[PDB]
Amino acid sequence: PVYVDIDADSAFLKALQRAYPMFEVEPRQVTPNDAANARAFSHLAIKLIEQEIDPDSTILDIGSAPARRMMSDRKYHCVCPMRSAEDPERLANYARKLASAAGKVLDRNISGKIGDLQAVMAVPDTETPTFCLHTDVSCRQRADVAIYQDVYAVHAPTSLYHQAIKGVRLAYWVGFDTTPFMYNAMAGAYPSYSTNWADEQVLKAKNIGLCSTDLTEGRRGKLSIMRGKKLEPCDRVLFSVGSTLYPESRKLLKSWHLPSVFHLKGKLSFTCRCDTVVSCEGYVVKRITMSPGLYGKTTGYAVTHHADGFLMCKTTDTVDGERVSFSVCTYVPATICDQMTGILATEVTPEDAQKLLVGLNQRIVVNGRTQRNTNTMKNYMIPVVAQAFSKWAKECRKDMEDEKLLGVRERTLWAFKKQKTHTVYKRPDTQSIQKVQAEFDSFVVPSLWSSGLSIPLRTRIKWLLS
Amino acid sequence: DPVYVDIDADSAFLKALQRAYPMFEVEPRQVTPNDAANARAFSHLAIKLIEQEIDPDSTILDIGSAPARRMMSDRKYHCVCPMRSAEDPERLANYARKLASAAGKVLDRNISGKIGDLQAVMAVPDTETPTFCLHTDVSCRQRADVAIYQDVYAVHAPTSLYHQAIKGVRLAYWVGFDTTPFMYNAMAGAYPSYSTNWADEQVLKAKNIGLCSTDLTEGRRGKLSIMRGKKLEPCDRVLFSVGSTLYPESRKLLKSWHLPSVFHLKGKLSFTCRCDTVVSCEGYVVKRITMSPGLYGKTTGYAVTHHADGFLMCKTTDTVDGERVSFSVCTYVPATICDQMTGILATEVTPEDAQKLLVGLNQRIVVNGRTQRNTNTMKNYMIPVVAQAFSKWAKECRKDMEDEKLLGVRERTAFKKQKTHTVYKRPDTQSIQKVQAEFDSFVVPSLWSSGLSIPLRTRIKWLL
Amino acid sequence: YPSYSTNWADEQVLKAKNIGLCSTDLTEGRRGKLSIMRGKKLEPCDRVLFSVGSTLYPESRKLLKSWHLPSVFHLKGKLSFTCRCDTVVSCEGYVVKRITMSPGLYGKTTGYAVTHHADGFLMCKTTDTVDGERVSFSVCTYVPATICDQMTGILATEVTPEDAQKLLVGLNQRIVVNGRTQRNTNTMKNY
Amino acid sequence: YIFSSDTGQGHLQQKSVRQTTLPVNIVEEVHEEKCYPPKLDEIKEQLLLKRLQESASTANRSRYQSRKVENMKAMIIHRLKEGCRLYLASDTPRVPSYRITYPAPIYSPSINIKLSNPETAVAVCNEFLARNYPTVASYQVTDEYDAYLDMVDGSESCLDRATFNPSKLRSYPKQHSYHAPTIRSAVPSPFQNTLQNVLAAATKRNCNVTQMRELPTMDSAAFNVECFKKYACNQEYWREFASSPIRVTTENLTTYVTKLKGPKAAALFAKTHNLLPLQEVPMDRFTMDMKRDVKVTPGTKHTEERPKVQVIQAAEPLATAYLCGIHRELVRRLNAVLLPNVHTLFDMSAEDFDAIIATHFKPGDAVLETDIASFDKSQDDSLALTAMMLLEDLGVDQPILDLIEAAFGEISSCHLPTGTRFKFGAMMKSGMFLTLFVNTLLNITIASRVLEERLTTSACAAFIGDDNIIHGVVSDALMAARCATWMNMEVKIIDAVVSVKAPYFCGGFILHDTVTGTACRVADPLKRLFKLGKPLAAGDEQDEDRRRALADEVTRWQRTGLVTELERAVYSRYEVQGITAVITSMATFASSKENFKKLRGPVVTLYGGPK
Ligand SMILES: Nc1nc2c(ncn2[C@@H]2O[C@H](COP(=O)(O)OP(=O)(O)OP(=O)(O)O)[C@@H](O)[C@H]2O)c(=O)[nH]1
Ligand SMILES: Nc1nc2c(ncn2[C@@H]2O[C@H](COP(=O)(O)OP(=O)(O)OP(=O)(O)O)[C@@H](O)[C@H]2O)c(=O)[nH]1
Ligand SMILES: Nc1ncnc2c1ncn2[C@@H]1O[C@H](COP(=O)(O)OP(=O)(O)OP(=O)(O)O)[C@@H](O)[C@H]1O
Ligand SMILES: Nc1ncnc2c1ncn2[C@@H]1O[C@H](COP(=O)(O)OP(=O)(O)OP(=O)(O)O)[C@@H](O)[C@H]1O
Ligand SMILES: [Zn+2]
Ligand SMILES: [Zn+2]
């Protein structure tokens, strides 16, 4: 049995059980965290990964919290640079836990861990079988398994290549789905995990999931600088999971949307694959296998399978008192989409679509009881979804009165006309395909390392371990 | 293991407390008909939670606290009690009376030790003691590792935190009201779940707000005075009323506690800090702050607030001192009410119609076995202002769909700005603000003087 | 104060017609009479009469208002003191207060008094005939909390006084607590 | 039906006969109503018809129909009188009767509350349905293809003694046009006239055989009439009534025919050419009629199982016209022998009922309500003997009894469109002109026998149809043991307490006022609410009688001193909250003609049009 720290009566139990049929999930709540669903999936995923691989193998952790892998029966080697504000707190916590258990559990090599930690504090540049202060590039430890857990700050082709030359043949990745960022969207949401993300240029919106605005009366004309006349996505994106803020970049996010098969050239050559194992309403688990040599050929295509509804439409909002338009995206439950196919055969107004969605939402498993009746979908996304369906139905009609010849195109001499597109709707049991790059032969190493540890921090750890 | 609170047995606030503290069991026990019972229940449970995770045999600093409330605890406390309010002399006398009457009967909690430390401080008012002190937060010399702030709004947070970290403090806690409404520059607001109202000093003669008073008049067709106005903007004077008690406060000190996620403190020594929110319940929040020496990472200067209940802010028209003006009012709305109004707001609703539906939806549940057959989800005196806000929100949303622009480009003339009269934050939505995350200027006057009197000294010595 | 059968009135309106403490006599409407003094003003004076049941007490406004102490205030003279005032228990307008005094000057004052209402409070303008002459003044009273809650919906529109009177009567009679014998069970006095 | 139907026509009258202008009860005498004898005139019709052509704005036409209908009524009397020459009799001296009167009722003032936007009213009603009834609010996702789905699956039936032609069992749907409803209640449309539906309706199996007219059957009937006459009737009229029979008389026919309307008189006139004599008309032959409306009750049961099909067994048109003049006399005689504390709804109005129970029901009083619908009256032959014994004691003339008896034995039914034959044994429910009377008599007899002397000592008892209410009676084991002689589910009983669990009677609630302190009866709001979600057939122009009926019913709901009581009564019966908003929504709908148009939508046509 596996115990999760979520409420004993919630709609997320069914999804977790369906995605993990080889376990038994039992709820046991001890803390009112605001991101319980996010932590529950990660706990189950890491338990499955360590169970799928054989024992007596060495494992690397790129983004590692040493206190998390302290009571495990495996062999973890942690790579812990000092480039984040979280790092000093985590290191002190790790030292306190080690010193607080020295004669209670003599089964996890506690004495070795303390000895390895002390050696590193003496010489920062030394390497130990358990701890080090290098990066994913400067580390020089041999193993065969690597694990990535919620890592978005590295370049995937470069990081994978440096791990291969050290004898690693298997890798794992756990994180958010990167499909919405391949469609070049402006904002989006993950309703099941209370996650909202938005571009930096629309942080002063009015009716989106992450914005803030003031009260104004209205003025005609304002002083300004040279006209922009453009509104396009930029490289900076802000994430908000629960009540915690994370900044991200678009280029590093799209680099993890790896193709089905790709080649890694350079000094040594390898062939690679990529498969998706677990998918649940936004989280995915990916497995990568690597082998020396060069075999076969590459097509440079990526495929995503949709078990739920995916929507992307165009909306009008007032940003800092000025009316503009951009695009958003979200997810829809499968049951809602299946029951809306009878009304989309004709043209409907947004008001009528909204009324049907509301009436179809309160239908819950526990019927009139409001304990487990958390509704099928969150109510704050209904207005925008209703508009998307109305636009889709209108566009699906005009195609019917403009039938053309079978086989030939039409140019009216030159200048063939393009049509309007305001919504994209991917129904369940469909697939999406994009074109990407599948050949990399450009690798560069800085070959320079700078320490990040300080004197007062080193003294505190030594005192704690005393 | 059970926790006792001074709350009436059949009350609706018990469910909220149980969900906010799932690791405890709460059972009511009423002995006093206080007018602010809900406010004290949260603070009692918060202190029990905080002291449970901290490592024992560790010293804790208290800033501006009454030593009487912490006498039976089995921890080590260092009380920092200056003399700058009309409350302090009463608290000191009560502490001495309880301490003297507890001698011998309680053979624990170091009663015999600290009973002889109070007289030592009274002898020389400039000495340190492991139990008592008489300086300010920036003048104490005791060294510890944990600091606790409880209902403190009279200090500058960047300055106070820096002084505590110099002495070697790596953890801090804060308990108090949410500071979100004061980042929106509002004139008046309410906390209906805790019977708390607050208003600006310029609108104390209003008619239909939470805290005001007016008189009858007949009307003068044109009155000339010696005052010039044509300005109405918030100032740095706010009055709080919790139950029947009044507290004057300032906006600048309130906004200083809305700390960002990551900030740097630079000076003779340097530290990096973080701020997280642990417990939130309809207005009360608990914040945990960790500090560490050195320079690490990067800062962005943003603050994020997560809404579990609906947050509303609208524009209202009232009559202040016989004159008609307009300002802004903010309040909180329960989640269940917001969810059931989704289908109605799609159409066009007048303020009169919206008020009638809210009243019908309010009285519900109707428990017969428990409480009374009639129960109200939200306080009735805030319904008229709430119904007005929804009407304005529905009109603005409809006007945007009728005027759609092109994708990508914005048209200039240097542009026309539309009017906004309502801000509505639905449940499960986050708001983001921009603040300062780099502090380097710190001033330490340290002109401390003994704020004490001979008659008070004589009374304490003779009573003890 | 309806819950305690107490009525008070100013000395100048003792000959009114429709208040809780007054007395008058029948007249036919004799128009006329002349005098020298010209009032032209009707304002409160420093004479108030109290009636608790059948007992009469005369009071003064100045001494009554002197007990509305603020939260904090200072006493200055040969010796200096600082002190507070708090409210402990209140029940439909009859309260108990506690004052603690200490020697010395500490803190600063603001000069504000706060009152918490657990039930409705009304003050309106009424028209009545005092000694046969029509005048207008102000009256105050208390209202039960449960009555105020149930009138929220009606007050959303414009309602005539007669319609409001009929609605109030229907809400007054209440049946759940009668015990099948008390029947009447008035929530508030009908006068 | 009884009090009032959807169109406000009802079964009760609208004239008060039980009202007095004194604060005490006064006994009075029952009188007779004189009827104007119709007369024949042809010269007036000829001149009026010619004068109709030259000028006719609005009232000139009305004089023609009045003259034309009056001529038809006289012709019917002349033809009908000649047929029953062997049964016609004269007027004998009558037996006087007396009745009790009551003071007028007192009502509380009413205040009207309504919204403004009609679309908001629909949203409130839809929100109410979804919150309380989740499954009902999500059924409708497409059009109404119920007829097609019934054809795809086969026919299942449970018949007995029936014949039909298999070559005519085909159920392809025909054209169907209607208006799309706005309220999300899924009220089904009336069924189509097919052979499949007829067999589905007649899926009842009541084949039970007992002693027809033997000694054990007579003994049970003899005891039943003894209990009725000992515990529910006084002894001051039996010997006088037996001496004076009841026979067919010219005054009975003249009064009856004059009360018919225009279209009814014309239909009867069309069947007077080949007029059969009274002794030639068969009394055990019926026809089958299907045109009905489905009955739905609050709850979630019609979204899971298909509802049943209602049928009507119509008797001979001449049979119900020859003998329908004796109903008035039977009602008068029955009311004369009953005790003062036992009442029957016959010959009353809405106001009279309120005045009777004005000062009897108070909070904290136990009321027993019992229905006898769930009982197989065809199993025992003694249920028919008891009714005949009561009828004979009332003074029915002997040859007329034989004609009545012939309709309570073996009967046959036929379906004209398909030529389907059905045979039934002893049956109580039918379409004859003694159905309410016999059911009322049996209802009183059953209650009297079970309750014994507890019925005599009571404050107020009311009996009508298959429903009854008795004051101050609780449920004990004595009635269970008495009723368990044969089985246990003969009747259904429910205990009610005033101001705690409101009693239910004839689709209404009995509530005690607060301002005045008197009892009153009001309608059921949830039953109305589900009814507005019923589709309207195209071409119907009956959207004005319903608005007036709704307006009258809304006013009675908003009386002061009944708002709180109505809330508790509905919750204690259906476990639903928030009905004040629904009543307010109903108020704005019944305010104007255009406001009533928001309950309909665009016309949808199915199975029609070769395009
Ligand atoms: N976009 C983004 N999400 C992250 C990152 N790190 C963690 N998360 C997710 O945020 C969720 C909440 O994490 P928190 O508990 O608030 O922060 P923490 O200190 O790392 O603690 P744990 O996640 O429980 O180990 C995690 O479950 C992750 O799924 C990150 O670096 N970037
Ligand atoms: N705005 C503001 N609120 C306060 C302050 N101090 C306390 N409060 C809150 O007001 C509530 C009223 O508490 P009290 O009835 O005065 O009793 P107490 O909390 O034990 O503290 P005392 O004032 O010493 O009696 C407290 O529970 C606090 O939540 C303050 O200084 N400013
Ligand atoms: N090679 C690496 N480069 C950068 N970070 C690494 C590397 N290896 C591990 N990490 C860890 O990744 C985490 C993210 O560090 P980052 O530089 O992105 O700062 P951040 O802004 O706080 O995080 P984020 O950009 O995801 O919001 C750090 O804790 C770091 O220890
Ligand atoms: N710099 C400080 N350090 C420690 N305690 C302080 C400091 N300033 C004020 N206090 C404490 O605050 C408590 C009461 O608040 P304060 O001193 O501001 O008086 P006040 O004006 O009456 O109330 P308020 O806090 O609302 O301004 C006092 O007990 C005082 O000891
Ligand atoms: Zn390493
Ligand atoms: Zn000190």
Q: Could you identify the residue written with the tokens 């940003």? A: A319
How far apart CA D303 and CA B7 sit, in angstroms, is 47
Token reading at A349 = 């107004």
Maximal CA-CA distance, chain C: 68
Residues having CB within 6 Å of any atom of ligand 2: B 36, 39-40, 43, 66, 151, 153, 240, 242, 245, 247, 249
Contact C175 D499 (CB under 8 A): yes
Sequence-distant (6+) residues with CB within 8 A of B55 are: none
d(CA D455, CA D448): 7
Contact D365/D472 with Cβ under 8 angstroms? yes
Closest by CA to A165, choosing from A141, A132, A129, is: A141
Q: Which of D436, D223, D446 is nearest to D345 (CA)?
A: D436
Nearest CA among D166, D176, D175, D174 for reference residue D196: D166
DSSP class per residue in D247-308: --BHHHHHHHHHT--HHHHHHHHTT-SS---GGGS-SSEEEEE--------SSS-TTTSPPP
Closest listed ligand to the CA of B134: 6
Quoted resolution (Å): 2.8
Taking the CA of residue C72 as reference, the ligand 4 atom at the shortest distance is: 22
Tokens 């691989």 — which residue?
Answer: A53
Point out the residue among B262, B347, B405 whose CB comes nearest to the CB of A324: B405
What residues contact residue C108 under an 8 Å CB cut-off, 6+ apart?
A: none
Measured at the alpha carbon of residue D134, what is the angle toward residues D132 and D135, in degrees to the nearest 5? 135
Among A182, A178, A175, A304, smallest CA distance to A233 is for: A182
Going from the C-alpha of B366 to that of each of B16, B211, B374, D364, D496, the distances in angstroms are 18, 31, 5, 21, 21
What is the spatial distance between Cα D384 and Cα C38, in angstroms, rounded to a whole number? Answer: 97
Dist. CA D128–CA D586, nearest whole Å = 13
CA atoms within 13 A on the CB side of A106: 1
Query: How far apart (Å, rounded) are the C-alpha atoms in residues B386 and B190?
Result: 12
Interacting residues of D398 by C-beta distance below 8 A, sequence separation 6+: none
Does the beta carbon of A136 lie inside 6 Å of ligand 3? yes
Structure-token match 């040599």, residue found? A293
Q: How far is CA C117 from CA B361, C120, C143, in A?
A: 25, 7, 11
Q: Are A101 and A466 in contact (CB under 8 A)?
A: no
B-chain CB neighbours of D184 within 8 Å are: none
What angle, 0 to 180 degrees and rounded to 10, lies between the N-to-C axes of helices D398-405 and D382-394?
160
Task: Please state, in angstroms and rounded to a whole number, the distance separating the CA atoms of residues B334 and B351.
Answer: 20
First to last CA, chain A: 38
Chain D contact for B346 (CB, 8 A cutoff): yes
In whole angstroms, what is the distance from residue D445 CA to residue D465 CA? 13
- With a 6 Å cutoff on the Cβ, whether A42 touches ligand 1 is yes
- Judge if the beta carbon of residue B56 lies within 6 A of ligand 3: no
User: D149 vs chain C: nearest CA distance in angstroms?
Assistant: 48
A453: CA distance to ligand 5 center in Å? 15
Strands A25-27 and A2-4: parallel
DSSP calls for D401-427 = HHHHHGGGS-EEEEETTTTEEEEE-S-
Which residues contact residue B179 at a Cβ distance below 8 angstroms, ignoring those fewer than 6 apart? B254, B255, B257, B258
Neighbours of A303 (CB within 10 A): 11
Residue D212 φ/ψ, nearest 5 degrees:
-65, -65
- Spell out which chain C residues touch chain B, with contact meaning CB-CB distance below 8 angstroms: 71-72, 82, 84, 86-87, 89, 100, 102-104, 106-107, 110, 112, 114-116, 123, 125, 138, 148-149, 152-153, 156-157, 176
Q: List the alpha helices (DSSP H) in B363-453.
A: 383-401
Give Cα separations from C174 to B306, D51, D502 (angstroms): 45, 68, 17
B187/B203 Cα distance (integer angstroms): 8
Q: Give the distance (Å) from ligand 2 centre to CA of residue B242.
A: 8
Tell me the two tokens of residue B445.
């006057």
Beta partners for residue C82, in sequence order: C74, C102
- DSSP letter assigned to residue B193: G
Which residue type occupies B218?
Answer: E
Dist. CA B37 → ligand 2 center (Å) = 11
Identify the burial level of D175 via C-beta atoms within 10 angstroms of its C-beta, where 0-12 means exposed, 13-18 middle and 19 or more buried: exposed
Looking at chain C, which subunits does it touch, using at least 3 CB pairs closer than 8 Å as the criterion?
A: B, D
Site to substitute for ligand 1 among A4, A6, A39, most atoms within 8 A of C-beta = A39
Q: Tell me if A450 sits within 8 A of A137, measured CB to CB.
A: no
Apex CA C24: angle with CA C20 and CA C27, to 5°?
Answer: 145
**Structure-token pair, residue D265:** 């008189």
Pocket test of ligand 4: the residue of B61, B62, B85, B452 to mutate, having most ligand atoms within 8 Å of its CB, is: B85
Distance CA B64, CA B137 (A): 8
Closest to D570 in 3D by CA, of D517, D529, D516: D529
**Dihedral angle computed from the Cα positions of residues B387, B393, B396 and B398, in that order, rounded to the nearest 10 degrees:** -90
Enumerate the residues of chain D whose CB falls inside 8 A of the CB of residue C178: 363
Residues A159, B188: Cα–Cα separation, whole Å? 55
Query: Angle D486-D487-D489 (CA atoms, 0-180°, nearest 5)?
Result: 140
Q: B428, A210: Cβ pair inside 8 Å?
A: no
Of D109, D111, D515, Cβ closest to residue C173 = D515
- For residue D350, the surrounding DSSP H or E stretch is helix D350-356
Tokens of A464: 């704690």
Say whether A359 and D138 touch across the interface (CB within 8 A).
Answer: yes
Contacts of B306 by beta carbon, 8 Å cutoff, 6+ apart = A34, A194, A242, A243, B277, B280, B430
Exposure string of A226-240, with b = 16+ CB inside 10 Å and e = fewer, is eeeeebebeeebbbb
Please enumerate in sequence order all residues whose Cβ is within 8 A of that of D91, keeping only pairs 6 or more positions apart, or say none: D249, D251
Distance from CA of B212 to the nearest CA of C (A): 10
Pocket test for ligand 2, best of B242, B257, B284 (most atoms within 8 A of CB): B242
**Strand-pair category, B146-150 with B59-63:** parallel
Task: State whether C106 and B86 contact (CB < 8 Å).
Answer: yes
How far, in Å, CA of C183 to CA of C176, rounded?
Answer: 9
- Going by beta carbons, is chain D in contact with chain C, meaning 3 or more pairs sit under 8 Å apart? yes
Q: How far is CA D137 from the centre of its chain?
A: 31
B446 Cα to chain C: minimum distance (Å) = 19
Ligand 3 atom with the smallest distance to the CA of A82 is: 31
What's the per-residue H, E or C state across chain A? CEEECCCCCCCHHHHHHHHCCCCCEEECCCCCCCCHHHHHHHHHHHHHHHHHCCCCCEEEECCCCHHHHCCCCCEEEEECCCCCCHHHHHHHHHHHHHHCCCCCCCCCCHHHHHHHHHHHHHCCCCCCCCEECCCCCCCCCCCCEEEEECCCCCCHHHHHHHHHCCCCCEEEEEEECCHHHHCCCCEEEEHHHCEEEEEHHHCCCCCCCECCCCCECCCECCCCCCCCCCCCCCCEEEEEECCEEEEEEHHHHHCCCCCCEEEECCCCCEEEECEEEEEECCEEEEEEEEEECCCCCCCCEEEEEECCEEEEEEEEEEECCEEEEEEEEEEECHHHHHCCCCCCCCCCCHHHHHHHHHHCCCCCCCCCCCCCCCCCCCHHHHHHHHHHHHHHHHHHHHCCCCCCCCCCCCCCCCCCCCCCCCEEEECCCEEEEEECCCEECCCCCCCCCCCCCCHHHHHHHHHHHC
Q: Which amino acid would we find at residue A210?
A: L
What string of DSSP letters covers B155-188? S-HHHHHHHHHHTT--EEEEEEE--SGGGTT-SE
- Phi and psi at residue B142, to the nearest 5°: -70, 145
Closest Cα in chain B to A386: B346
Closest of A2, A43, A38, A9 to residue A374, by C-alpha? A9
Crossing angle of helices A382-398 and A350-359, rounded to 10°: 130
CB atoms within 10 A of CB B52: 9
- Burial letters B181-213, b for 16+ CB under 10 A, else e: bbbbebbbbbbbbbbbbbbbebbbebeebbbbe
**Residue B128 C-alpha from the chain's centroid:** 32
Contact D547, D588 (CB under 8 A): no
| Cα–Cα dist B428/B433, whole Å | 17
All chains having 3 or more CB pairs closer than 8 angstroms to chain D: A, B, C
Which residues have CB under 8 Å from B226's CB, separation 6+? none
What is the DSSP code (8-state) at residue B329? E
Q: Which residue of B has its CA nearest to A100?
A: B55
Interface contact D578-B364, CB threshold 8 A: yes
| Bridge partner list, A59 | A76, A145
Contacts of D393 (CB under 8 A, 6+ apart): D225, D238, D241, D242
* Chain A: partners with 3+ C-beta pairs within 8 Å: B, D
For D150, the enclosing helix (H) or strand (E) is: helix D146-152
Instruction: Measure in Å the smallest separation between the Cα of C19 and chain D Cα atoms.
Output: 26
Compute the distance between CA of residue B4 and CA of residue B16 in angstroms, rounded to an integer: 15
**Protein residue whose Cα sits closest to atom 31 of ligand 3:** A81
Distance CA A457, CA B1 (A): 39
Q: In this structure, what token pair is assigned to residue B410?
A: 């914005």
Which run of H or E residues covers position D224? Answer: helix D215-231
Q: How far is the CA of D413 from the centre of ligand 1 (A)?
A: 79
Q: Which of A152, A173, A150, A176 is nearest to A65 (CA)?
A: A150
**Contact, D115 vs B356, CB < 8 A?**
yes
Q: Whose CA is nearest to atom 3 of ligand 2?
A: B151
Cβ-defined contact of D130 to A358 (cutoff 8 Å): yes
3-state secondary structure D164-211: CCHHHCCCCCCCEEEECCCCCCCCCCCCCCCHHHHHHHCCCCCCCCCC
CA distances from B230 to B227, B233, B325 (A): 10, 10, 10
Secondary structure (3-state) at D25: coil
* Count of beta carbons in the 10 Å neighbourhood of residue B126: 9
Q: Are C45 and C68 in contact (CB under 8 A)?
A: no
Where chain A is broken, by preceding residue (C–N > 2.5 Å)?
Answer: 412
- Length of chain C counted residue by residue: 191
Between chain C and chain A, are at least 3 CB pairs below 8 A?
A: no
Query: Would you call C166 and D109 a contact, using CB atoms and an 8 Å cutoff?
Result: yes
Q: Which residue has the tokens 């000294």?
A: B457
Q: Which amino acid is at C8?
A: W
The rounded distance, in Å, linking the Cα atoms of A204 and A318 is 9
Instruction: For residue B343, list chain D residues with Cβ-Cβ distance below 8 A.
Output: 123, 126-127
Give residues with Cβ within 8 angstroms of D603, minimum separation 6: D177, D178, D179, D538
Backbone angles phi, psi at A353, to 5 degrees: -65, -40
Residue of C nearest to D514 (CA): C173
The alpha carbon dihedral of D53, D59, D65, D70 has a sign of: negative
Neighbours of A200 (CB within 10 A): 12
CB A18 within 8 A of CB A307: no
Alpha carbon A293 to its chain centroid, in Å, reads 31
| CA-closest candidate to residue A424, choices A348, A283, A327, A324 | A327
Tokens 């089964």 sit on residue: A107
Note whether D561 contacts C163, CB cutoff 8 Å. Answer: no
Q: What is the residue type of D152?
A: V
Nearest chain D CA: its distance from A390 CA (Å): 17
Give the C-alpha separation, D467 to A95, whole Å: 83
Regarding the beta carbon of A320 and ligand 1, being less than 6 Å apart is answered: no
Q: Rounded distance, CA B255 to CA B262, Å?
A: 16
In whole angstroms, how far apart are CA D175 and each of D158, D188, D307, D538, D580?
29, 17, 22, 11, 40
CB contact under 8 A, A358 and B342: yes
Instruction: Check CB contact under 8 Å for D514 and C169.
Output: no
| Pair of tokens at residue B408 | 């990508």
User: Which residues of D are less than 8 Å from C149 in CB distance?
Assistant: none
Nearest chain B residue to D131 by CA: give it: B340
- Cβ(B407)–Cβ(A325) under 8 Å? yes
Q: Where are the beta strands (DSSP E) in chain C?
A: 6-10, 48-52, 55-59, 72-75, 81-90, 95-103, 120-130, 133-143
- Which whole-number Å values give the CA distances from A197 to A181, A241, B309, D579, in the listed order? 11, 9, 20, 42
Minimal Cβ distance to C106: which of B85, B243, B376: B85
Euclidean distance between CA atoms D510 and D470, whole angstroms: 13
Contact D117 B340 (CB under 8 A): no
- CA dist D11 and D182 (Å) reads 31
CA dihedral angle for residue D402, residue D407, residue D411, residue D417, rounded to 10 degrees: 130
Q: How far is residue B21's CA from residue B286's CA, in Å, rounded to a whole number?
A: 12
Between CA B78 and CA B117 the distance in angstroms is 12
Q: How far is the CA of A159 from the centre of ligand 3 (A)?
A: 13
What CA–CA distance (Å, rounded) separates A20 from A45?
9
